[PDB]
Amino acid sequence: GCGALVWVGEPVTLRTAETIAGKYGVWMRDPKPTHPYTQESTWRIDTVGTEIRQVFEYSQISQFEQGYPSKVHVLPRALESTGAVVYAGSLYFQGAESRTVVRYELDTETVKAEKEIPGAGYHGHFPYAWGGYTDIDLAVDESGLWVIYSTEEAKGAIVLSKLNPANLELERTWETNIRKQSVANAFVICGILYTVSSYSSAHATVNFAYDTKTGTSKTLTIPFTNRYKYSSMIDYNPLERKLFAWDNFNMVTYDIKLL
Numbered sequence: 001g002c003g004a005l006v007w008v009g010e011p012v013t014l015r016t017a018e019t020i021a022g023k024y025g026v027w028m029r030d031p032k033p034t035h036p037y038t039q040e041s042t043w044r045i046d047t048v049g050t051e052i053r054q055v056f057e058y059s060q061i062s063q064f065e066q067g068y069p070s071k072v073h074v075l076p077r078a079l080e081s082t083g084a085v086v087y088a089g090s091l092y093f094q095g096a097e098s099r100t101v102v103r104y105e106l107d108t109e110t111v112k113a114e115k116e117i118p119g120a121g122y123h124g125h126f127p128y129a130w131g132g133y134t135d136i137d138l139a140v141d142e143s144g145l146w147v148i149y150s151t152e153e154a155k156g157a158i159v160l161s162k163l164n165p166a167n168l169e170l171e172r173t174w175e176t177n178i179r180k181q182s183v184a185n186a187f188v189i190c191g192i193l194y195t196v197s198s199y200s201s202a203h204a205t206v207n208f209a210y211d212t213k214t215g216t217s218k219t220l221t222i223p224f225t226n227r228y229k230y231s232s233m234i235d236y237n238p239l240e241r242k243l244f245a246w247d248n249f250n251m252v253t254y255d256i257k258l259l
């Protein structure tokens, strides 16, 4: 059952990248797995380099922990930053030097939809506090697919849109009063957008919650540990009820509890 976030566990490290190209990246499982994948299927994308086009796939968690992909997908265009998600058999990612979200069906290796996110800043315009090109952050929660961004119209405040997963049409949009560049990262749980205060502190907090049901925000002080002091990616998986994160070469999870 859904509820507000009340607790975040301490990070558990599943894999440590062995090259500097893995200092930051995105890794994830599918909260709505579809044949031929399972809830154990894992994807991993190192994103420090240029021309990021290869997506590593692991059919078993033990393969992921040992660093041995079972498949490698080649994307037809390059991918930007750490914000991508997998949902219902597709990778949703941002095209390099663009504000375009691309739907890449993993089993057929085909692009099924593209969508320019209207007004979205990109390429270091509205990054998170972590910097880089973290302007556009996709998210999956219990009700489906979302994208987190900002616009000049919103003057840098986080904008949140719900997306049709088949054709990437924007179904609804909310404008917060939370400055995107002031928070380390963000994610959605049960229709509530949460932000993290710091990418480096061992005593950070989940520090804001914006509820889409009310269109209002509140402060929070839920403790959050950046164990390795450089978190580039923090997302939520509603099937596992865990945060998945990338922190200074380490692919980690945080258990969460809801009220």
Ligand SMILES: [Ca+2]
Residues within 6 Å of the ligand: 137, 138, 139, 185, 186, 187, 233, 234, 235, 236
């Ligand atoms: Ca995120």
Ligand SMILES: [K+]
Residues within 6 Å of the ligand: 080, 081, 082, 131, 132, 133, 134
């Ligand atoms: K980046």
Ligand code: NA
Residues within 6 Å of the ligand: 082, 083, 084, 085, 137, 138, 139, 234, 235
């Ligand atoms: Na994301």
